[PDB]
Design a protein around this ligand. Sequence first.
Ligand SMILES: CNC(=O)c1ccccc1Sc1ccc2c(/C=C/c3ccccn3)n[nH]c2c1
Ligand code: NA
Ligand code: NA
Ligand code: NI
Ligand code: NI
Length: 266
Amino acid sequence: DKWEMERTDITMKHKLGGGQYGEVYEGVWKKYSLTVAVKTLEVEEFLKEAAVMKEIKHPNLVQLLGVCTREPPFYIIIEFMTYGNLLDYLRECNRQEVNAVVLLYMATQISSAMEYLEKKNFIHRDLAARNCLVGENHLVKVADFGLSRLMTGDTYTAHAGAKFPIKWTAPESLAYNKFSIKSDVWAFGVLLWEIATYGMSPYPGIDLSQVYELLEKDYRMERPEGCPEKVYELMRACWQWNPSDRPSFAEIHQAFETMFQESSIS
Ligand SMILES: CNC(=O)c1ccccc1Sc1ccc2c(/C=C/c3ccccn3)n[nH]c2c1
Ligand code: NA
Ligand code: NA
Ligand code: NI
Ligand code: NI
């Protein structure tokens, strides 16, 4: 395995982001003088997460640097994203800096990554602002591929009693445990809303237990202040009850590439 490397190549620092990420550590890869992120350690899931990261490559997907899978503790070496997660980044930013153009740019990058996954027949299953990472100059990458899967059909069935982030999860996924690229499209809609609100929590003040009933009744979050109408329209298409009525990531991406360029012209 070309991805396999010597653990002693890495000097292990403190846990990343005060522990919010689970067991993931800042580390220094000494040879290359490089700060990296190291995921350590059922290991069954852990190892497949690594095999997946070896299959996917894209400028907006967090890149695998290497692994030590041969003996415990197991390492998963991932590129270090200097600004941390998108949620905290949106909350803490200077909005004059991270403005309407930047928000468009973020959606374009993320949708670019999802269009690539869609074309490859993968699903992510954990899309959300907390799972995106931010680099210099508002570079954004999707991370956390632990639940990512290469599909054999058009649908994937989570194991019985698996539990999900209710406010990001598509109705068919909540009810039937069925995931598809369409379910990702739904979650991407929630991510857009997180972006438009600079990291507000979705369905504000609405208790988790009532969310599914509301969706069945075709309640959807309102258009965030300052959110351009075209973007709200996309959100609403993402939240269609029928998965087959949700746009593809190819379409979503094209819509953002268009908006982003027109905004850059101004
Ligand atoms: C087990 N958990 C994950 O794999 C996971 C889940 C959600 C989001 C990310 C990750 S893995 C991860 C975590 C942090 C990073 C970073 C840097 C994090 C950071 C950097 C500055 C300040 C605060 N946090 N670079 N690359 C990373 C990869
Ligand atoms: Na999801
Ligand atoms: Na599962
Ligand atoms: Ni593109
Ligand atoms: Ni494209």
